């Protein structure tokens, strides 16, 4: 059972910079049978490096592997557009083969505060017994945002999902949707609905809300 810890989980560099992803093993890895894979969301992994340092067939030279024992490094100097994906290290010294959780390399951009909108549940869906309040956060950066729901001032929990897009191809920004889903019964028992969003680019927390029916 060789556990593999990769860090950072997410790394934020600019194109052209150098990137050093680290992979640490929970014990020494016999013969350094460690490999690195690259994956773009959607596609399948592709081998980049094997035997801790040996490049592969048709894999550029900014990609280099090093280290041994329980410390390994996948460094890629001169980050190019297509290099901003996820990366996994794996050890095949034993088998059980095991993987690391992956570190994602993202494009650093400047702070963009989000624009937020709140949508009340539609009558139609309401007739269905379930009402879904949504709160959309548009074009923001960095990725971290706190999105809290409050109903009649009551902080909510375990009743909202959350989905976030991948970094925008032309913007480098993110958008996210937070959904509050509750029983039509519960929904009609309350008056004010509010989603509070906290983000590094807002001087103070922005809160959006509407009153049941008055919309």
């Amino acid at each position: 059972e060789i556990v593999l810890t990769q860090s950072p989980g997410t790394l934020s560099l600019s194109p052209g910079e150098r990137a050093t992803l680290s992979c640490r093993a929970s014990e020494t890895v016999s013969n350094d049978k460690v490999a690195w894979y690259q994956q773009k969301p959607g596609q399948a992994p592709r081998l980049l490096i094997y035997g801790a340092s040996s490049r592969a067939t048709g894999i550029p030279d900014r990609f280099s592997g090093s280290g041994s024992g329980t410390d390994f490094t996948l460094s890629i100097s001169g980050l190019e557009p297509e290099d901003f994906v996820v990366y996994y290290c794996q050890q095949y010294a034993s088998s059980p083969r095991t993987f690391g959780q992956g570190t994602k390399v993202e494009i650093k951009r400047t702070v963009a505060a989000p624009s937020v909108f709140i949508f009340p549940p539609s009558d139609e869906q309401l007739k269905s017994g379930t009402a879904s309040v949504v709160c959309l956060l548009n074009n923001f950066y960095p990725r971290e945002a706190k999105v809290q729901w409050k109903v009649d001032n009551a902080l909510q929990s375990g009743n909202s999902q959350e989905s976030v897009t991948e970094q925008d191809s032309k913007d480098s920004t993110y958008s996210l949707s937070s959904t509050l889903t509750l029983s039509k019964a519960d929904y009609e028992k309350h008056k004010v609905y509010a989603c509070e969003v906290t983000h590094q680019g807002l001087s103070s927390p922005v809160t959006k809300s509407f009153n049941r029916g008055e919309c």
């Binding site: 992994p45 996994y88 959780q101 958008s175 996210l176 949707s177 959904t179 889903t181």
Partner: protein
């Protein structure tokens, strides 16, 4: 060029059995060191190794999934088979097979995956609801409206927004889907310039989705500003 192709049921109920097959071409399970294995990836998470089978028919398993896993090769048909019993939703994921071409070159060739959703529910198409910006206290920049494709399976929709004057819109706002009680929900939104909506007769725009179980298409009412 070497090649692998996976295939299997794209939907299956729990407490059951999944069988996947990696049909490969370009090599034979005969050379030393050479081997093939199955690795899955739950949506949004990391790669996870299941089982591996060597030429010489030596098989190796992931403890945590062993005694539920079974790997086999048919040199006859050039296709390795994987069997997973007691399916659970947590077993939903993309399943890949890959070939290690030697002793050190690990998984140099990967298949392409096949997403295997594990829900007791049945392949239902989306049911749509409009999302109208209950916006105000500052309309501002532009106005936004959405569309909530609900209760579908398998996860596989697309969005296209069209006008009354049946043209096309610039939404790009498509959020990945969220899994709610065996069924998947998704949101899509779109921004229109405040100037346009506060004018035209267009009392709406239409939301269009193409799920393989039905191609519903509801219409969402703009808000009227000026």
């Amino acid at each position: 060029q070497v090649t692998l192709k996976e295939s299997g049921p794209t939907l299956v109920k729990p407490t059951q059995t999944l069988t996947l097959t990696c049909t490969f071409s370009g090599f034979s399970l005969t050379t030393t060191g050479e081997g093939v294995g199955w690795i899955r990836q739950p949506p949004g998470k990391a790669l996870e190794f299941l089982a591996f089978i060597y030429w010489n028919d030596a098989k190796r398993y992931n403890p945590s999934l062993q005694s539920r896993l079974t790997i086999t090769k048919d040199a006859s048909k050039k296709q390795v088979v994987l069997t997973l019993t007691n399916l659970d939703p947590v077993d939903t994921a993309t399943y890949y097979c890959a070939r290690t071409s030697g002793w050190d070159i690990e998984f140099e060739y990967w298949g392409q995956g096949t997403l295997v959703t594990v829900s007791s529910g049945s392949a239902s198409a989306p049911t749509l609801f409009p999302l109208v910006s209950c916006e105000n206290s500052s309309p501002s920049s532009t106005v936004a409206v959405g569309c909530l494709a609900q209760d579908f399976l398998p996860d596989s929709i697309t969005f296209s927004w069209k006008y009354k004057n049946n043209s096309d819109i610039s939404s790009t706002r498509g959020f990945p889907s969220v899994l709610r009680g065996g069924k998947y929900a998704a949101t899509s939104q779109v921004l229109l310039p405040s100037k346009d909506v506060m004018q035209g007769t267009d009392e709406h725009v239409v939301c269009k989705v193409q799920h393989p179980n039905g191609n519903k298409e509801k219409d969402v009412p703009l808000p009227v500003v000026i």
